[PDB]
Each structure stands twice: as structure tokens, then as C-alpha cells.
Write a protein that binds this ligand. Structure first.
Ligand SMILES: CC(C)(COP(=O)(O)OP(=O)(O)OC[C@H]1O[C@@H](n2cnc3c(N)ncnc32)[C@H](O)[C@@H]1OP(=O)(O)O)[C@@H](O)C(=O)NCCC(=O)NCCS
Ligand SMILES: CC(C)(COP(=O)(O)OP(=O)(O)OC[C@H]1O[C@@H](n2cnc3c(N)ncnc32)[C@H](O)[C@@H]1OP(=O)(O)O)[C@@H](O)C(=O)NCCC(=O)NCCS
Ligand SMILES: CC(C)(COP(=O)(O)OP(=O)(O)OC[C@H]1O[C@@H](n2cnc3c(N)ncnc32)[C@H](O)[C@@H]1OP(=O)(O)O)[C@@H](O)C(=O)NCCC(=O)NCCS
Ligand SMILES: CC(C)(COP(=O)(O)OP(=O)(O)OC[C@H]1O[C@@H](n2cnc3c(N)ncnc32)[C@H](O)[C@@H]1OP(=O)(O)O)[C@@H](O)C(=O)NCCC(=O)NCCS
Lengths: 140, 141, 140, 141
């Protein structure tokens, strides 16, 4: 169900209707320290100029880092949401796939941080994202 | 244009309705060389599974607005403009209504333009900001 | 005492010996929503290439935003420390002064955020800094 | 060189001991086109009034290391390199000892190089990181 971490019996928005399901993000591997996700490039992932939209790398990094945090913290009573996403763009992608790998670099009580690398089908580094995730007690 | 994006060419590789922006519904309202605005109606397509506007939606609305506001000026000077850095910070979530974005240009150099984007809810509250650095380069073809 | 907010009767490091006092940062105005600070350019503020060091704008923004938060929160039992500082550089400064203005844009329970603008003697925008400040209960 | 900064010119505008870097004591240890390291002994000159290493000290050590590691390669190709964006995030404070910085190059484009800088304490713990984007331009004079 994009293979997002199954941590709750109900979610407000079904995968297929979310932004993630609309553009087609799917999680491959997920561990407490490292997660991967990928997407096929389609027009839905593109801006009008034919290259993958800058926002799509941002969103891929956002979901992967946040959900990789959720995977650990939800069962502990916490919620995780993005608090900063800094994405830098090195090389565009016209077609193929975008593959993201998030490596956890800090896991603090209130903040987790993930380095996300976004690669094309040749393995070339096309973008990176520094993802800062706020971790707070779940609300009643 | 589709999405009211600036019309600076006779044709584009991908039509508005098929692009990310048209799929999620981003629309440009005002556009000038120093300030531009855009908005989007929140629907599920804008949300993460947890029911709030997805962090990547604010990133993408900022990305398109700041980049296109640059394109509007530089394209006819033979330049291309593409996001080079997008730093979005999240202050308050949006569950429903609209997200309204205003991009204010703060630096227009020869190789980089920089825009401060504020993303507000229907109550006017500041829900996210994005610092958008846009690379400007001569067009290749 | 660089005119930093007088919120405590003792501080661990005297102004003149801190990084701030060494390079000469001084706060001019401070309110809950807006603060200003300035520095004379000297070699101490410069890199070996003769222009003001990128780190000096970063540090000016860091102290101004953090201390402008401290000014409000210390009396409430909280500590404030920088958690993210993103500085972008638009135009170098060779000599004169650097003047910083921090405008508060969000004041949340756990995070305050300040937009800092760094201007030369002509008023030109030379750098900006997006300052994210963590606010936490003071420790015993 | 003073601070062991790369020696790529016969003279510099400002001597090491008088610059910010020499005042606070930054020293480069290893330097290669893809990886560089530097360190600094914590003393009060590195601290804010509250007694911890000043957030701007990590920013500045990252700024100098990533920029100079670029200079080491591009200067003799007639290019100048200067910080364009420095995004430093703070995970754990340092009260005393040293701060040790390692810059790993992750992109070397024609106009921008990008380095990931990790800043560690004497126990090896990751206390801060900086994403350093460095503009590379032809030298003017
Ligand atoms: C920003 C920050 C408070 C966020 O907390 P976090 O990411 O949830 O990290 P944690 O809360 O897990 O704690 C990590 C370390 O932060 C410090 N810290 C956290 N909360 C603190 C508090 N309320 N008071 C004092 N120090 C605190 C402690 O050194 C802590 O280590 P410890 O728990 O082993 O004592 C913490 O990351 C931090 O202190 N970063 C450094 C800020 C800094 O040095 N900036 C410049 C200072 S001049
Ligand atoms: C990063 C940068 C080179 C990118 O250029 P840009 O965003 O396109 O801005 P512009 O190129 O329009 O020019 C702005 C100023 O940058 C400087 N600059 C730009 N290219 C330069 C070059 N090749 N050599 C020397 N200075 C240059 C000049 O001061 C220029 O002003 P001028 O054109 O009036 O001489 C430029 O923004 C900059 O120099 N920023 C400051 C970097 C800095 O100070 N970091 C710390 C230094 S120790
Ligand atoms: C990151 C964040 C939790 C940090 O908290 P902060 O800067 O200290 O802000 P505050 O804690 O003052 O609270 C501001 C709003 O955040 C939300 N929030 C804060 N803590 C929360 C929690 N534990 N659970 C749920 N929502 C919370 C609430 O909407 C809150 O408003 P309210 O207090 O009027 O209900 C908060 O800024 C935030 O929620 N930002 C948005 C994150 C986001 O939307 N990312 C993408 C989601 S798909
Ligand atoms: C921002 C950027 C232009 C800066 O250039 P840089 O860091 O110096 O990197 P380089 O210029 O060395 O080149 C990297 C790639 O950028 C692209 N590029 C650079 N200049 C270009 C130009 N004038 N026109 C078209 N593409 C260009 C090319 O794909 C280039 O690869 P190539 O040289 O093998 O053709 C470049 O890093 C980039 O294009 N990043 C991607 C931007 C992006 O995809 N954002 C979203 C688009 S919708």
C-alpha cells in the first residue's frame, strides 16, 4: 500500500488517493536506520518542461524520511511529521525512474534527521534532501 | 496558459493537465517580475495518508511558483531557469481548504535568483515557508 | 555587553572572550518580533581572500536570532539554541560593516523561526539566513 | 600554509593569524579533491556566552573547509570558489575538547560543487552537519 509501514489499522487517506499514490511512490526497504523508495517517471511526475518536477524529489524525500521515522516511533506513542526539507538539485531527470535512499544520521528525542539521495537509472546523483523530522507525543 | 503559468513559448513538452502541477491543481494568480502568487484547493491528491497536506505539496507549489516567476522574466532573454535549492520549513499543518503561496523576489543575480515563498491557509496563518534558489543559465538548444 | 539581552546574573563566558566579542558583534534593537545587530568589518571577520568570511554572516545571524528568542523565553523557564541555520550568500563584503535584521516569522512552543537579512553599508542585500531556534525547558 | 590551507597562490590578502580562521584556530588536516578534514581546539573564542561551542563556529568551520577544498582544485584552473549556501543543522552541543570536521564531496558541477560536512566531538559523536554549496566562477582579475 505503496508498501508504507503498516502501523495503524485505519488511515485517513487511502494510498491510491494520496499525493504519493497519485504520482506512484513505492517504499522498497525500510529499517530503523535506512530506507529506500522509488518511482517510475510519468508525466504526473513532470513539470510542463518535460523534466521531473523539483517538487517530486522533495515529496519523495519527504515521505520516505517521515515514514521511516513513523515506522519506529508510532508504536511508541509518537507522531512524526516533516519540519524541514532542504532539497538541492544537481542533474535533471527526463524519463526512467527516481530512486531514493534515506540514511538516518541523528535520532533525537524530538528530532530525527535523514540524508536522502535521489538517483537516476544510471545511478547518478540527481538530487539530495536533508530531512528534519519532528517527533512529538501523539494527541488524544 | 494551462494553470495560468506564464505563456512564454508557443508549445511545451507536457500539457498542464498531465503535469504534476495540473494533477494536484496548482494555479497561478498574480505574476510580476518581483512578486507572484498561486493557490491550490486541498483535496486528497494533495494529502499524505495521515490526512494533512503532504509536506512535498508545499515544496512543489513553492518550486513551481518561484521557478516560473523567474521563467516569466528570463525566457525571452534566451535563458532557462530551474530550481537549484528548495528549502521548505513547516510551521503548522493544513487539513483542508486552500494553500495560498506568495513568492517575493529578494535577489536577481546573473546566475541565481532567490525568492522567499510564504504558504498560508484560508485563515491567513503562515503554515510553511520556502527559500527558493533558482539557477539561471543560457538555453542549450 | 555586546548589548546581549540581560536575562541572567551570571554567564559562563564573558562577552569580550566569546566568538561574538572577538569578532565584534553588537545588538542594536531587540523586541519580541524584530532585532538588529551590526559589526565593523576587520580582518578578524575576513577569510584569507580579503572578503568577509561566509561563517561570519552565519554567526551573526545565529547569535541575533538565538538571543532574540532567549530575550523572551529565558524568564519563562526555557532555553533557546540554534537548531538549523541556512545562510545563502548573494554579494560579498570587502570592508565597511555588516548590518543584520532578524524578523520573527513563527513563534511555536518548541520552535521559533527568524528571517535574517545581512546588508552592507550601501543597504544592499549581501546574505540571508533562515534561523530555526529550538525552545526547550531549562535543565536543572 | 598558515592553517595548512591549500597553498595555491604566492600571496593572500590576509594572513592566517589575522583572519577569522586563524583567530579561532581552525586547522586543515587532510585535503584531497573528494574529501577534506579540519579541526579546532575549543577555547572561549569558539563559544557563545552560554558556554557551548557557538552555532556560527560549526557554520564557519564547514564554510572554510568546503570552500578551500574546492579552491584546492579549481584555483589553478583559473576559477574562484566562494560559499553560495551553507545549511548547518545542530544535533548535540560541544562544551569543550575539539570539533572535528570531515567534508565529503558529493557533486562537482561546472558552476557549483556540493560537500556534506560532518562535525564531530572528541567522542566521535555527530554534533552538527553542514550542506555546503560552493559557487565556482572564472576569476575576474
Ligand atoms: C536542538 C536540540 C535541543 C534538539 O533536541 P533533539 O534533536 O530532540 O536531541 P535530544 O533532545 O535527543 O538531546 C541531544 C542532546 O541535546 C542537548 N539537549 C537536549 N535537550 C536539552 C535541554 N532541554 N537542555 C539542555 N540541553 C539539551 C543535550 O546535550 C542532549 O544530550 P543528552 O540527552 O545526552 O544530555 C538538540 O539537538 C541540541 O542541543 N542541539 C545543539 C544546539 C546547539 O548547540 N546550538 C548552538 C549552541 S551555542
Ligand atoms: C555566489 C555568486 C558568485 C553567484 O552570483 P549571482 O547570484 O549570479 O550574483 P551576480 O553574479 O549577479 O553578482 C553579484 C556579485 O557577486 C560577485 N561575483 C560574481 N561573479 C564573480 C566572479 N566571477 N568573481 C568575483 N566576484 C564575482 C560580484 O561581487 C558581484 O557583483 P558585481 O557584478 O556588481 O561585481 C554571488 O552571488 C556571490 O558572490 N555571493 C557572495 C559569496 C560570498 O561572499 N561568500 C563568502 C566569501 S569569503
Ligand atoms: C513541526 C511542529 C510539530 C513543531 O511544533 P512547533 O513549531 O513547536 O509548533 P507548535 O508546537 O507551537 O504548534 C503549532 C501547530 O502544530 C501542530 N502540532 C504541534 N504539536 C502537535 C502534536 N503533538 N500533534 C499534532 N499536531 C501538533 C498543531 O497543529 C499546532 O497548532 P495548535 O497548537 O494550535 O493545535 C509543528 O510546527 C507542525 O506541526 N508543523 C507542520 C508539520 C507538517 O505539516 N508537515 C507535513 C505533514 S503531512
Ligand atoms: C542547477 C544546475 C543548472 C547547475 O549546474 P552545475 O551544478 O554546474 O552542474 P553542471 O552545469 O556541471 O551540469 C549538470 C547537468 O545540468 C544540466 N544543465 C546544466 N546547464 C544547463 C543548461 N544551460 N541547459 C540545460 N541543462 C543544463 C545538464 O543536464 C547537465 O548535464 P550535462 O552537462 O551532462 O548536459 C544543474 O545542477 C541542474 O540542472 N540541476 C537540476 C535542476 C532541476 O532538475 N530542477 C528541476 C527541473 S524541473
Amino acid at each position: 500500500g505503496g508498501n508504507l509501514p503498516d502501523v495503524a489499522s485505519h488511515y485517513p487517506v487511502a494510498y491510491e488517493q494520496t499525493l504519493d499514490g497519485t504520482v506512484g511512490f513505492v517504499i522498497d526497504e525500510m529499517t530503523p536506520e535506512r530506507a529506500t523508495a522509488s518511482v517510475e517517471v510519468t508525466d504526473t511526475l513532470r513539470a510542463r518542461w518535460g523534466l521531473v518536477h523539483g517538487g517530486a524529489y522533495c515529496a519523495l524525500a519527504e515521505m520516505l524520511a517521515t515514514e521511516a521515522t513513523v515506522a519506529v516511533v508510532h508504536e511508541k506513542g509518537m507522531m512524526a511529521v516533516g519540519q524541514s526539507n532542504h532539497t538541492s538539485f544537481f542533474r535533471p531527470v527526463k524519463e526512467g525512474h527516481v530512486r531514493a535512499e534515506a540514511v538516518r544520521i541523528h535520532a533525537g528525542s524530538t528530532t530525527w534527521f535523514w540524508d536522502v539521495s535521489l538517483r537516476d537509472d544510471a545511478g547518478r546523483l540527481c538530487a539530495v534532501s536533508s530531512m528534519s523530522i519532528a517527533v512529538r507525543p501523539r494527541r488524544d
